[PDB]
């Protein structure tokens, strides 16, 4: 019951474009990467829980480098959020509102973040605050 993967820019475009009522969660990185391994285990374990309002996709940014420049994907692991084709920003308290770029292994915490993104974006917020301050 693995997480779905997207294998080119075109597929990523279609996936971001295809959800009217769910957050599109994208993990940019590589399966082989340790940070990605920890983040993937979280995403895998919450995928069923959030499936009504979020879909999660994994993208290998070697196989799919299309967005590297666009979203400055220079970290080992990057989770980003999209709603109705729009990049949703989250104030995590880190100074960077564009992405989660560390493996947070708190399962419920990740669920709560996704739910906040969904609830915010549905009400037209392009920026939302994370429930916990990450320093």
């Amino acid at each position: 019951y693995m997480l779905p993967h997207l294998h080119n820019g075109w597929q990523v475009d279609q996936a971001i474009l295809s959800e009217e009522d769910r957050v599109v969660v994208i993990r940019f990185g590589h399966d082989w990467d340790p940070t990605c391994m920890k983040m993937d285990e979280v995403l895998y374990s919450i995928a069923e829980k959030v499936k009504n309002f979020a879909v999660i996709y994994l993208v290998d940014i070697t196989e799919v480098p299309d967005f590297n420049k666009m979203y400055e994907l220079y970290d080992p692991c990057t989770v980003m959020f999209f709603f109705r084709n729009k990049h949703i920003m989250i104030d995590l308290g880190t100074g960077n509102n564009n992405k989660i770029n560390w493996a947070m292994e708190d399962k419920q915490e990740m669920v709560d973040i996704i739910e906040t993104v969904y609830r915010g974006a549905r009400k037209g917020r392009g920026l939302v605050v994370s429930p916990k301050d990450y320093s």
Partner: protein
């Protein structure tokens, strides 16, 4: 439909306060009753995890 509980300190001993609507929490926020925030969580599901209300936008759950 969402419901909240909160405590003044983030400790295992602090009193928790009955079920509240999101609108109720929002009114209390805007009226200055949580000037340093309170430690709140949704009542469903039971898991919990308490957050400082200062980071919670109660208007998102209305």
């Amino acid at each position: 439909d969402v419901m909240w509980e909160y405590k003044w300190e983030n400790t295992g001993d602090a009193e928790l306060y009955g079920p509240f609507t999101s609108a109720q929490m929002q009114t209390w926020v805007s009226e200055g009753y949580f000037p340093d925030g309170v430690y709140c969580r949704k009542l469903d599901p039971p898991g919990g995890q308490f957050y400082n209300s200062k980071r919670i936008d109660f208007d998102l759950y209305t």
